[PDB]
Every structure is written in C-alpha cells, then in structure tokens.
Amino acid sequence: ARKLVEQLKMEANIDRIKVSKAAADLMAYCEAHAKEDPLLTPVPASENPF
Amino acid sequence: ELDQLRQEAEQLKNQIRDARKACADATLSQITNNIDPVGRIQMRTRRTLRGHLAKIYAMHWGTDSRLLVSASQDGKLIIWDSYTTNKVHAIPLRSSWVMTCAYAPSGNYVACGGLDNICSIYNLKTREGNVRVSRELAGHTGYLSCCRFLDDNQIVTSSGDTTCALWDIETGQQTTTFTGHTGDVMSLSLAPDTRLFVSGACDASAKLWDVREGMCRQTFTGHESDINAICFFPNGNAFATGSDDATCRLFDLRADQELMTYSHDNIICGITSVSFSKSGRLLLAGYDDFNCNVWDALKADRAGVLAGHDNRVSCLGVTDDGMAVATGSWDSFLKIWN
Amino acid sequence: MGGVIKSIFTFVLIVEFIIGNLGNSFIALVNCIDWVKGRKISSVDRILTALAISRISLVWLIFGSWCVSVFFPALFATEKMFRMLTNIWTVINHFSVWLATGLGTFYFLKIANFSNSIFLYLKWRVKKVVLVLLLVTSVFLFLNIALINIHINASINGYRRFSSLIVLTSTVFIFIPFTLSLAMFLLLIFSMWKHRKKMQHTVKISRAHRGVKSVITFFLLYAIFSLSFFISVWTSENLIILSQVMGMAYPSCHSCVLILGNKKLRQASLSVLLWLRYMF
Amino acid sequence: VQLVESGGGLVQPGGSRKLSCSASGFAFSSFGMHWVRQAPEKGLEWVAYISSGSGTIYYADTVKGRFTISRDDPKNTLFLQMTSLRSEDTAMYYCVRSIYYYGSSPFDFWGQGTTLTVSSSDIVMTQATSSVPVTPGESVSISCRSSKSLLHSNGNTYLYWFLQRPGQSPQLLIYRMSNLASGVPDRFSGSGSGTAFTLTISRLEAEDVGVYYCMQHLEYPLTFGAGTKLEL
Amino acid sequence: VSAEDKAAAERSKMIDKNLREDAERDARTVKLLLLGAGESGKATIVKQQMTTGIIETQFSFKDLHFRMFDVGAQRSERKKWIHCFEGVTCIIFCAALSAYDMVLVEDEEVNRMHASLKLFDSICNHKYFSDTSIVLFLNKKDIFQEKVTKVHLSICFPEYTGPNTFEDAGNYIKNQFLDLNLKKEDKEIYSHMTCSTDTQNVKFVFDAVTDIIIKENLKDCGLF
Ligand SMILES: CC(C)CCC[C@@H](C)[C@H]1CC[C@H]2[C@@H]3CC=C4C[C@@H](O)CC[C@]4(C)[C@H]3CC[C@]12C
Ligand SMILES: Cc1cc(C(F)(F)F)nc(Nc2ccccc2-c2nnn[nH]2)n1
DSSP, rough: OOOHHHHHHHHHOOOOHHHHHHHHHHHHHHHHTTTOOTTOOOOOOOOOOO | HHHHHHHHHHOOOOOEEEEEHHHSSSHHHHSSSSSSOOOOOOOOEEEOOOOSSSOOOEEEEEESEEEEEEEEEETTEEEETTTTTTEEEEEESSSOEEEEEETTSSEEEEEEETTEEEEEEEEESSSSSEEEEEEEEEOOOSSSEEEESSSEEEEEEESSSSEEEEEEEEEEEEEEEEESSSSSSEEEOOOTTTSSSEEETTTEEEEETTTTTEEEEEEOOOOOEEEEEEEOOOTSSEEEEEEETOEEEEEEEEEEEEEEEOOOTOSOOEEEEEEEOOOSSSSEEEEESSSEEEEEEESSSSSEEEOSSOOOEEEEOOOSSOOOEEETTTOOOOEOOO | HHHHHHHOOOOHHHHHHHHHHHHHHHHHHHHHHHHHHOOOOOOOHHHHHHHHHHHHHHHHHHHHHHHHHHSSSHHOOOOHHHHHHHHHHHHHHHHHHHHHHHHHOOOOHOOOOOOOOOHHHHHHHHHHHHHHHHHHHHHHHHHHHHHHHHHHHHHHHOOOOHHHHHHHHHHHHHEEEEEHHHHHHHHHHHHHHHHHHTTTTTTOOOOOOHHHHHHHHHHHHHHHHHHHHHHHOOOOOOOOOOHHHHTTTTHHHHHHHHHHHHHHHHHHHHHHHHHHHHOO | OOEEEEEEEEOOTOOEEEEEEEEESSGGOOOEEEEEEEESSSSSSEEEEEEETTTOOOSSSSSTTTTEEEEEEETTTTEEEEEHHHHOOSSSSEEEOOOOOOTOOOOOOEEEOOEEEEOOOOOOOOOOOOEEOOOOOEEEEEEHHHHHHHOOSSSSSSOOOOOOOOSSOOEEESSSSTBTTOOOOTTTTEEEEEEEEEEESSOGGGGGGGGGEEEEOOOOOOOOOOOOOOOO | OOOHHHHHHHHHHHHHHHHHHHHHHTEEEEEEEEEOOSSHHHHHHHHHOOOOEEEEEHHHHESEEEEEEOOOTOSSOGGTTGGGGGOOOOEEEEEEESSSSOOOOOOSSSSSHHHHHHHHHHHTSTTTTSSSSEEEEEOOOOHHHHHHHEEEETTTTTOOOOOOOOOHHHHHHHHHTTTOOTTTTOOOOOEEEEOOOOOOOOHHHHHHHHHHHHHHHHHTTTOO
16 A cells, blocks of 8 residues: 555645636636637537538 | 554545645635526537447547547448548448547547457558558557547557556557556546546546656546546646536546536436537536536536437537537437537 | 118228228327327338328228218219229229238248348348339239229220129239238248247247237138129129228228237227226 | 559551550559540640549540540459540550549559550630749749639639659649648648639759649549749 | 539448448348356357457358357456447356356355356346347256266255256256346247257257347337
8 A cells, every 4th residue: 555655645745726716717718718619609600511 | 554554545535635625615606606607508410420330439520620530339430521421431440349439630540449458540641542550559458448649659548457558659569557546447538738638437536647757646536436438628727527427527637626516316327428618618418318418617507408319429529619519329320519 | 681781781881981990090190199209110110100091091082982972972973983983992002002012021021031142132121122012013003093994994985884894803903912912921920930840949948929810810801701702793782882891891900900910009009998997 | 552554556547446554552442543645745634534433434525435434443454445546646645543532632643654656614724834944942933823713612722733754754742722742842832812823842953843734623624734844 | 512522422422332231241140249157168168169358259050140259358347348239139148057066266255156146137137138138058067967966956055955866956057047037028048058068059049049030020020
C-alpha cells in the first residue's frame, strides 16, 4: 500500500481554488461563446448541407 | 505495518475530504439561478446513414466536421460523408468484435479495437487505392475500450486490464503505461491542449493523468456504478461523466470535486455516451432507453429529447464547429441532428 | 321449396357479410392501431392488412351487388351493370386471392428448410419474391378479364342466362393459385415432419399446431363445398344468390382462420374478450 | 504504380486498331480510367472515360461512335477499341487513373503512352500566354481563364493543373484550387475566383521547365487548354 | 450535382452492393458462443468439432457453417462485453459430471458443480440472453461412471437421498441444470452426455441449431 499512500499524498498537495470561482469561470466561458454555438442559437439557412 | 499503512491511507482520505469540503462555499445551482434558461431546444434528423448490418458501437467525427467514421459488429469501419450521405470507405476488419474507433486530427489514419486486444491503425492516404493496416498495436491483456489520437504518431488507449497506455505508432511499442484503476477502464477523453486526459472506469472513479509524466494527478469518486462515458468541457478545466446509475456528473479540475448532478427520477437506465456542445452550455447524454437527452450544463434541467432510435444509442459526438450531432445506435442507424 | 331455400341462403349471406366485415375490419384495425401507436410491424402484418383491405372491398362489393339485386332490380337487370360488376369483381378477386397465395409463399419461403440454390435465392429476397409474384401474375388478371369480356360479349350477341361459362371460367382462374398454395402447404408439412423425425433419431432432448389444425380443417371444409358448387352448375333457380353466397365464403371465413394462427391477432382478440368480460 | 500501354504503329485510314494498357501496383477495380490524346504539334485532348464497375461510359464528340472503351478488372487491363481511323487521330494516347471521393486526387498518375500514326456547349479554357522566358530563382505566374464559372454550389472550383516535362508523361500539381498533389514540392501554389485563375511558382529550378496545362472537371467532355511553355 | 459528386455517389453505390453481397454470403453462417468453467472440457469440445483474447473455431456440417467463439482469455468483468453476443444463435455450455467434490484453485470453494450452476444462473437468466437457446454438454462421463461407485453424489448436494447409479445421478445433475431458468416457454436447453471419445457431437449441435433456426423463423412469421 506504499504506492497507494504515495498517490494519496501526491493528490492532497494541490492548490485548490474556490468552487464559486470555477462556476463563475464556466459562466464566463458560456457567456463569451454563446453566440458562436449553432446548437444553442440555430443558424438561419446557414447549414450548407442541411 | 499493514495497519499503520491503512491508518495513514484513511487519514489522507479524511484530509482530502476536508480540503474538498473547505472549498465548497456555494453550489453551481445557486450561482446560476439568475441566468436565463436556454429554452426548448428541438433538433431534427437532417441525415440518416444506412449501410450497417449490426449494432454500431462507436463513431468519431473529423476535424473538418464533415467526415465521420463508424464501427459495427459486422466487421466494417465505414467512413461517411455527412453532407451528402456518401460512403468514402468501407474498411473490413480482421476481428468483427470492435468496441471503439477514432479518426486522426489530420485525417490520414483511423483506429479500431475491441475483444481482439489489438489497436489497429489504418492508412487512408496511400498511393494504392485501398486502405491498409499501418500497424497492429498489441500489449493489452484486457479488451480495448477506447482509443484516441494525439497526433499522427501517438495514440492513447484504454483497456480492460485496468490500465491505460500511450503508444508510438512508428515503433509499435509502449511509451507510458497508466496504472491505478481498480476496475475496467471504459472511456477516454483528451484535453484540447493535448497534455492531459481523463479516464472513467468501472470502480466508480475518474482519474486525471499527465501524458508527459505518466502519473495520476487527481481522482474523482462521486458515482455509484460503472462509468461508461467521459468528456472534457471545451475550456479544458472541467469534464462530465456518465454511468449506469442514470446520472451524469460535472467535475472541475481546480475545485477537485463535483459541481452539478444531472438526473431525473423518470430516467432509470444506463448512460452510454456523453458530449458537450461548442460553448459547453448544452450537455448531451445518450441513454439505454432508446433515446438521447439534452441537459443544460449550468442548471440541471432537461431542455430537449432526441428520440429517433429503435434500439439503444451507444455513441454520439458533436462536430468541432458545433453544427451537428451524430447519434449512433444498435439498430444499425446513424442520424445527424441539428 | 324455392322460397325457403332462398330465404335460408339470404340469412347465410347476411351472416357471412357480418362475419367477414367484422373479421377483416378487426385485422385491418388492429394493424392500423399498432401502426399509429409506434409499434413497428412486420411484413407478414403488411400482407395481412392488405388482405384485410382487399376482403373488406370484396365483401362490400358482393353485399352491394345483393342490395342492388333486391332493391330496385331494374338497374340490376341491365347488361352494362352486369359487365361492370363482373369486371370489378374479377379485378378485386384476383388481388384478394393472389395476396393470400403470396402470404402462403412467404410462409413457405420463411419456414421450410431446403438446401437448394434456387430456394436460397428466393429465401434471401422473400419480400422481393412476393412483390414480383404480385406483379408477374397480373397477366393472369388480364387474360381472365379478356376471356370474361369475350364471354359477356358473345352472350349478349347471341341473346340480341349463360352464367355457367362465367362460373366455370372464374372457378378455373380461382384454382390456379389454390394449387400453388396447396403444393406449398404440403411441402411445408412434409419438411416439418421430416425435421421432426430427424429430431428423434440424433438428439432426444428438445411448433404451434393450433395454427395448422384450423388451416387443415379449412382446406378440408372449403374444398367439399367448392366441389359441390360444380355439381349444380357445370355438370347440372337460386343461382345468383347461391353464387353470391359461395363467393363470400373464402374472404369471410379465411380471415377468421388467419386470426387464429397469428400471435398478434390472437392476442388482440383475447384482450378484446377480456375487455368484453370486464365491461359486464 | 505502373501504367504501361501497348499498341500503336502505322494504321491505314479507315482501318481498326486496339490499344491495351496494363496496370500494376494499385487497386485497379477502384479506379476510373481515362484516355487523353496529344497531337504532335498541339495540346492535350480528352478521349474517353470508364468508371469503376463500368457503369458510366463517356466519349468526346470527335470520337463518339468510332471509339469504344472497355476494361477487364481481373486481368488489370484497359482497352480502347478504335474503328474508322482518320488522319486527326495521329497522337500519343495516355492512360490516366482517377478516383472520386471526398478529398480525392483525380488524374493523379499518368501512363507512358503509345504513339499512333495514320498515313495520308464545351467550357473553353484559354491560356493566352505561350512560351514565356524564365530565369532560375525567380517567380513565375501562369494565368488561366474559363468561359463558364467553375465554382460549383458546393464551394469547389474544378480547375486542374498539369506539368509536361520534355520527353515525359504529364504529372498532376494542383487538383482543386490550392490543393497541392502528393509528391509536388511545396512551392507551387494556386489561386483564383470564378473565371480567372493563377498558378504561382515561388523559386523555380531546372526541373520545372515544361508545358503547363489547364483542365476543368465541372462537366464532361473535360476540355483542356493550350499549354504555356517555360523556357530558360 | 457535379461530375465528381456523381462519381462519388456511384462509388457509394458500389460499396453498398459489396456490403449487400457480403451479407448474402454471411447469412448462411451460424454464430455460437462457448462458455464453461476451467476444467469443464472446453478443450475436448473444440477438438471435437475440428492475452490472446477471443478464439474463433470454424467448422462445417451439411451446408451449415459455424463460428464458435471462446471468451476464456477475457479475465475482466463479463458484464461489460457480453452484449456483443446478443445476436448469437446458441450458447454451448460445458459442465463436468466428474465434479463430485473437485475444489477450485482457491481450495476453499464447495464444488466445481456449484460454480457451474452459478455460471448457468448468470447466463440463462441474463438480460441479453432471454430468448437465446443453450446446448448443454455434460462431458467427462467416463470419470463419472468410474466415480459414481466410489463416492456417492451426496458429497456435492446434501438433498439427493437416491441411488448412486450412473443413470439416476446423471439425470439428477441434468435436471438440476435444467430446472434453473425461469423462461421455460421461450428458450430451450438441449442436453447431452459426452465421453470425450464420441464422434456425434457435431451432429447434435447441427440438429439443435436447425431447431433454433426453424423456431426463429416460425416466431418472426408470427406463428408463435
Ligand atoms: C370460389 C368461387 C367458385 C365462388 C363463386 C365465385 C364466382 C363464380 C361468383 C362470385 C360473385 C358472383 C357474381 C356476384 C353478383 C352477380 C350479379 C348478377 O348480375 C349475377 C351474376 C354476378 C356477376 C355473379 C356471377 C358469379 C360470381 C362472379
Ligand atoms: C396458421 C398457419 C400455420 C401454418 C403452419 F403451421 F403449417 F406453418 N401454415 C399456414 N398456412 C400456409 C402455409 C404454407 C403455404 C400456404 C399456407 C396457407 N395460407 N392460407 N391457407 N394456407 N397457416
């Protein structure tokens, strides 16, 4: 179990940011790329094959 | 010394749980309670792809967002032209029990694998007009569950011998073996910067690895059943899971814990394939009850149902430009949605 | 004795119309309900609902012919309606009998076990085989219409009735697919018996007879009345009503034979009765 | 990849002759084959085309009826049956392989050719330049023009570029516009829009001396153009 | 539509024709799955019809072609790849009659018979094998005949209370395998006793798959 406790020691020592900051980063990416997503906002007749 | 090591492992697990619960100050559902809902996203089958004779187990898109590879238990690896519903290639396989397929970013190679324990790389661009096997990679004891291309020379594979491996196609040999999973490793997904990858296995855990270092950085244990599907966010700082407990879960790499669970009480079936949209807002998960569901990622509400398959959908993907979703099922049909 | 026999045959034809309309409406209605409520159907179900539509049309045509015969017979006595009704009847009946023959071909190709190369060529393309059987046998329909119209023209030229020749022509044209259906049925029974005898000499440790017993009973019960129909006509009063009764026996009772022998139609009939018993 | 043709020689007018091409080194059954003429003092002319599976046969207007093209896939042989030969059929006949899928490279390999001698609308491709002087290490632009706009509704411009080295078979450089062929060095470039076309050589060497030919694949019968010559 | 797009459509039609004729050629083949314990006589059966992963055994008998598949090299979890064999015609299950006591390699398990019945419960009552028939080979019957006299059958099952003759004990073992599927109407279990010297097992598999093919044709004709 030496490898197990070594992996658990390596996983613990990590710089962990706040959950609210990560959620806000996902909100920011969604808001920045909302216009360039054709599944979210459908494109009018710009589907070349469809 | 075994009791001392077990006590140290329990202490480290308690420390990790305390450090994860210390960062938890607000859920993602609370902070995204003010953003507007996406609505009533409805898609239609623009194209249907016929020509397979058995269950389709895997598909993968191209970087050009037009070419589509597919794998089925009839021993065929068909490369489709999604725009015109044309068959560019039909590659016969030595072993008909294929479970995964991949398409290279450059478009020059495809891969397949399964119960024959061999990842086969096929050369599409040859002076002769046929598609030939460039290399047969062997060395996995268990069944090959996923394969993905890093470039034309490196391919990363997940197998049923509880290990993931990174190969060098020119040498045909192992480069780094990733170890640490207890159960069968089922799915892979690669970050857009091609330096980290996450593997979901049957021990209800997902592990984040380093390609250049070959060590597990973080371990995410939130599920209760066998993880079957995995995909990063387009940002690369988050990923989504899919398991047999009828639950999709979103994890963050920096926060090192779960952020949002995607489950409705009317869904009791496994999840085969999970993918994101281009913006990451719109999470798509394929289930075992013969249809796909569309989830809003920032607020766990079902915003659509893709219901066009007689049998269970087993593989789905979104094109790199985000213009199409191709769901593949066990009724030998691929359907492109928009 | 003519009036009581006529009235008996009138009651028999009314019962046959009710039975045939109910049975074929049940088959078509069950298949249409299964088509609407998702629930994709097999090709045997498609042939069965095509047969149900054809037999509904046939029994409605013959009942309308009897209605024209009884009420306002002045339009019934005209030659023009005679020619139109005979041509419409043979057009409907050729499809209505060759669809049942194609269903028998479907059963023989799908069920029977043979190692011939031609048999495997037909067995790989069973839907194509029944479709080509439907399209190719239209030459029988064309030659039947030609001979019937020549007989009608000669009968009205000689007069300016002679329905025995019409009866003989239609009964000859109705027995060409009957021989094919009986040959395929006997071949399927022989193959099943050979396989059953094979399954008792090599392996000892190990087939719905409810489907086949009623079918054998129907081939036994219909072939005696269709042969007694020869005695009164060919070898020699109530000829029109007797012929309308005999023309409404196969599409009426063969639908009930086809109901008992299909799993879906038998299940729907059982559910039906359950609901009848639960409603009371 | 080898494509060796057989036949040729002095054929009397009104006679018959058969040209056979032997293919070795590639999947012959998955390739559509062509025949391309070249008169001794003229350019490249298209003769016939047979598809994979022999389901699509095409002929030029000059050789329709007189000429028949056929293939034998197990024998890996391509035939051109010629009847009623006139004095305008005196040319070297090339056999060209072509495969058609999404992203394919048609007209990729050309055969050596056999010389035939006889005793005694269409999209016009115009190359106004002819025999321009070149100096090594410079940049040469070869212009091409079309009567009909080759830009289809699918976004593909079907303009093909070929290089005829002296005493050699033609080679493919650019198949669709700005699509470099396999084996061509990455200094040739192509550009254009609709009617006008360009072919740019960045730093030409002694191996780039030859005749450069246009070709369209928008519709049959696949008209070429009178080539532009580079001479030192 | 362009000329190149037309030729690509023709290429797609040729590919469709090749796939269809490959389907026509492979329609006459019968796919089988062989399952069993470790020393259950799997090697004595593959020899009788004729990290590696699958092993495919091909053999023919009277205008039928068979493709047995051995999944003994896959030591991973069986539930994650058993759905690949959902369309097989039959499952050949091999169990040893000579498993009166026969403790496993763990050397604390009760019997090899109990592990065989556990695997039979896992296979016959599986979700993907609800209507797939089973051919059951009770092989090593020579050791069973030479072992019934020495050791009574009560050392395995403490409920027998019967004579230890060959026929009665063999029928008890066969019946205890057979009364174990709760789908007795749909699927059938064909049983045989093999002495590892017989030459008629291929005929048994051929007869059983003829039964299964006729019953499947009768079922999708709707006759039952
Ligand atoms: C199985 C067979 C032998 C049953 C008998 C079928 C044929 C002979 C029967 C069935 C329907 C019958 C027709 C029904 C009604 C009429 C109207 C009247 O104008 C008399 C003749 C005519 C046109 C009949 C002629 C005979 C007929 C065509
Ligand atoms: C309900 C049932 C069962 C069976 C079977 F049990 F034998 F398989 N066979 C039939 N019918 C036929 C079979 C072959 C040819 C023709 C007919 C036919 N069609 N109409 N009348 N006979 N039907």
